[PDB]
Design an enzyme around this catalytic site. Structure first.
Site, PDB file in Angstrom:
ATOM      1  N   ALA A 202       0.255   6.697  -6.794  1.00 48.39           N
ATOM      2  CA  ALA A 202       0.309   7.996  -6.391  1.00 48.39           C
ATOM      3  C   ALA A 202      -1.073   8.661  -6.802  1.00 48.39           C
ATOM      4  O   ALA A 202      -1.404   9.766  -6.124  1.00 48.39           O
ATOM      5  CB  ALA A 202       1.485   8.943  -6.853  1.00 48.39           C
ATOM      6  N   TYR A 203      -1.584   8.331  -7.791  1.00 49.62           N
ATOM      7  CA  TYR A 203      -2.971   8.684  -8.264  1.00 49.62           C
ATOM      8  C   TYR A 203      -4.175   8.305  -7.320  1.00 49.62           C
ATOM      9  O   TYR A 203      -4.811   9.116  -7.037  1.00 49.62           O
ATOM     10  CB  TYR A 203      -3.152   8.154  -9.739  1.00 49.62           C
ATOM     11  N   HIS A 204      -3.875   7.165  -6.698  1.00 53.09           N
ATOM     12  CA  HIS A 204      -5.151   6.760  -5.800  1.00 53.09           C
ATOM     13  C   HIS A 204      -4.653   7.111  -4.515  1.00 53.09           C
ATOM     14  O   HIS A 204      -5.283   6.884  -3.370  1.00 53.09           O
ATOM     15  CB  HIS A 204      -5.201   5.205  -5.995  1.00 53.09           C
TER      16      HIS A 204
END
Lengths: 395, 365
Positions: free
Chosen positions: A300-302
Site C-alpha cells: 500500500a505504501y508503494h
C-alpha cells in the site's frame, strides 16, 4: 576520551555506583520548583543512614557533588527524605537536590540523559560525603558505556559496587514451569515472548498494561532459561582464563542482542493479537531506510492508487533523547510520523522540536504521568494508536 | 550510534573479527594492503590453499561500514612462488581498492576491525565488513569494551567471544618466572610489577623488554589467583559473572601507567636523576627549574591525542604518515621512538626520529 578514563578510574576505586536516565521530574522539566534527583530507598540506608527515619519532617544532610562531565564548580548537594507522609501529608521519597545554578542535573534539556553517580563510601559507616557524577552530554558518550554494560532503559535504577556495575555483565538473580524442551534447547526471543504473553499475563486486556506485564515476565523467564543452560557449562569449569572470558562475552552478547530486540517483538505481537493485521516490519520505502513499522503494508505504501494520508509508520526508540531526528528521513510519503518511546518524560523544548517536525509520541499509558502536563495532553496510549489504525484499514 | 549497533550486529552474526591499529605499511604512508597473518587468511579462504597453479585466488566482497564507500571487490591470493621455482608461500588479501579507508595514509594509527562473515558449511569467506575508526570517540567505544589496543597488537577470533564487554587476550602464560611468595595471595599493583620487572628479568631494547616481562608476570599472577577456581567450575551464574567482571576490569586497568613508569626506571637508572611527574607526566631538569627545559609526554598511540600536550613526545605507534608528522614537526613536537620501531615510520620521517638512547644521552647534563 575523558569519559572513558573516568569509567576506568571509577571501576577500580572504592565507589558505589548508581546509574539511571534522568526523568522529566528529576531535571525539573515537569515544571515548578526543583525537587531533586530520585534515589532508591534501598540505597539510602547505605549512603545516607542519618536521614533514613521519621523522627522529624524532611531530614537531610549535605555532601560534596563533583561533576566530571561538565565544567561546573563543586557544590554542597542535599540528600533529603521527603517525609510528609508521616506528618499528615503525602510525600515518602528520598532525593538529592540543590546541585547549584547551571548544573547539568538541574537542566531540563538533559531529560532522558544517562547519568552515573559514583558515591564514595564513608570509611566509618556514616553518611557519604562525596559523589562524583557524569551526566552524558551526548549519544557518543552513552555509546561508550552502553556498548560495554548494555543499554540503560528508562526507569532502570542500577546500583552496586563500581566494579560489578561497570564490568560488562550485570549481576542479580532472584525471580515458573518451563516447557521440557527449553531444558534442552535455548528458545528464541519471540518464543520467550509468546510464552510470556500466552502463559502468564492475561490479567489485562489493555495493550499498554499487557506490554509492561509481559516485559516483566520475559525478563524473569529469560533469566531462568539462561540460568539452566549457563549453569551447566559453568559447573564443568574451564581450562584457561580466556576460555572463561570468552563464554562470559558470549553470554553478554546474547543478553544484549535479546534486550535490543525485545520491545519491537512485543509490539509486533500486540499489533497482531489486537486485530491490527496490516503492517510491515521488514519494509523498504526509499533507498534503504526501512522504518520499524509501516502501515498498512509495504504494498500500500508503494501503491500509486492508495491514499497517502492513510499511511502510517511507527519508529520504536526505547530512549528517544537525541535518537529521533533520524526518523524524519524514513518515509518520504508520511508527514505525520509516530514515535513509540519508554522514556520517563521529555522537556517542553524537546517536545516542541518533535512537534514542529510532525512527530507524534505513542507512550505506554502508565508512563504518561512522567511527562510535563502540556506534553502529556498530546500523548497517545499504545491502545489508542492501535485503535486509530484499526479503523483506517477497516477495509 | 551506528558503530554501537554495528558491534552488536557483528557479535551475534557468525563473524570472525580481526582487530589491530593500522600501521604505515597497512595504509601506504611508506598499495599492497593491511597485514593479516597468513594463517588467518588461509583458514578464511581454504579453496586457494593448493599448488595446482601459480598464485591462485578468489574474490570477496569488501563492504565498508565505517565510511560511506561503495562495495569494492578485494581478493584473497595464495602467493605460490616457492612451488614454482621461487620462494613465496603465504596467503594474503589485497586490492582493498584505492580510496578505501584502509588505503588512506591519514588513517595511520587508527583502530580498525575486519569482520569476515563465516560459512557454517565450510566454504570460503565471501564477504568482509570493514570498520576503520575515524575518531577517538569511536575508538573509546570499542576500547572500553575489549580494552586498550596497543600499537602492534593483533586481536582475532569468533566475534561473539571478543566483543561483549569483557577483555579477552590471546598470549599464553609463561611459567618460567620465579615470583615473590606473597603474590599468590595478594595481587601486586601495576607499579609493584613494573618495579620488579625493572629489578629482575640501549634502553630502547630494555623498555620494550621489561614491557613484555611485565605483561607475562601480570598474566602469570592472574593465573595463580584464578585458574584453579576457573578449572573447578561455578555453582551459580552470579559467581561466574562476579569473577568475569573482576578479571576483566583488572586487565583493562593495566594499560594505565605502564609506560610512564617503565620510562621512569630507565631514567633513574641511566644518569637522569631528578625530574618531576607533576607540577604533566614528565619534566626536565626539574620542577625547581620552573620558577629557558625539556617536557616529555607519553602516548602509547600518538594519533589524535598529542595536541593537548602543547599546553618531546614518546610514542610506540607503528608509524605516522608524512602529513601527520608535518603538523607535529610544527607546534613544537619532537618524537621519541624505540629503535626497533623507526623502520615502521615513513622513509622520510625515520631519519628524523630521536631514539630513547639519543634522548637520554642528550638530556644527560
Amino acid at each position: 576520551s575523558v569519559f572513558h578514563n573516568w569509567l576506568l578510574e571509577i571501576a577500580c576505586e572504592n565507589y558505589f555506583v548508581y546509574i539511571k536516565r534522568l526523568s522529566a521530574n528529576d531535571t525539573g522539566a515537569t515544571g515548578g520548583h526543583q525537587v531533586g534527583l530520585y534515589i532508591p530507598s534501598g540505597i539510602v540506608e547505605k549512603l545516607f543512614p542519618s536521614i533514613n527515619h521519621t523522627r522529624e519532617l524532611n531530614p537531610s544532610v549535605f555532601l560534596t557533588a563533583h561533576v566530571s562531565s561538565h565544567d561546573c564548580p563543586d557544590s554542597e548537594a542535599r540528600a533529603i527524605y521527603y517525609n510528609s507522609a508521616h506528618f499528615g501529608k503525602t510525600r515518602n521519597e528520598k532525593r538529592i537536590t540543590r546541585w547549584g545554578r547551571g548544573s547539568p542535573l538541574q537542566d531540563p534539556e538533559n531529560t532522558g540523559a544517562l547519568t552515573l553517580l559514583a558515591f564514595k563510601l564513608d570509611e566509618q559507616g556514616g553518611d557519604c560525603k562525596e559523589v562524583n557524577i557524569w551526566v552524558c552530554a551526548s549519544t557518543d558518550e552513552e555509546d561508550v558505556i552502553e556498548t560495554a554494560i548494555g543499554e540503560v532503559i528508562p526507569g532502570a535504577l542500577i546500583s552496586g559496587p563500581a566494579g560489578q556495575i561497570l564490568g560488562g555483565l550485570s549481576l542479580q538473580q532472584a525471580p515458573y514451569i518451563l516447557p521440557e524442551d527449553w531444558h534442552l534447547r535455548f528458545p528464541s526471543g519471540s518464543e520467550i515472548i509468546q510464552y510470556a504473553a500466552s502463559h502468564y499475563v492475561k490479567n489485562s486486556l489493555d495493550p499498554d498494561e499487557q506490554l509492561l506485564d509481559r516485559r516483566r515476565v520475559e525478563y524473569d523467564i529469560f533469566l531462568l532459561v539462561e540460568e539452566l543452560h549457563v549453569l551447566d557449562i559453568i559447573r564443568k569449569g574451564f581450562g584457561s582464563v580466556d576460555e572463561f572470558i570468552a563464554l562470559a562475552n558470549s553470554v553478554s552478547n546474547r543478553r544484549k542482542s535479546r534486550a535490543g530486540k525485545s520491545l519491537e517483538l512485543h509490539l509486533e505481537h500486540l499489533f497482531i493479537e489486537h486485530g491490527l493485521r496490516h503492517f510491515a516490519t521488514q519494509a523498504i520505502t526509499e533507498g534503504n531506510k526501512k522504518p520499524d513499522f509501516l502501515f498498512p503494508s509495504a504494498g500500500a505504501y508503494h501503491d500509486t492508487e492508495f491514499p497517502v494520508e492513510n499511511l502510517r509508520m511507527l519508529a520504536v526508540k526505547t530512549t528517544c533523547k537525541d535518537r529521533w531526528r533520524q526518523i524524519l528521513n524514513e518515509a518520504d510519503k508520511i508527514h505525520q510520523v509516530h514515535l513509540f518511546t519508554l522514556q520517563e518524560g521529555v522537556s517542553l523544548a524537546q517536545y516542541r522540536e518533535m512537534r514542529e517536525s510532525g512527530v507524534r509520541l505513542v507512550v505506554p499509558s502508565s508512563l504518561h504521568k512522567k511527562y510535563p502536563e502540556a506534553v502529556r495532553a498530546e500523548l497517545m496510549t499504545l491502545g489508542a494508536f492501535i485503535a486509530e489504525l484499526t479503523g483506517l484499514y477497516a477495509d
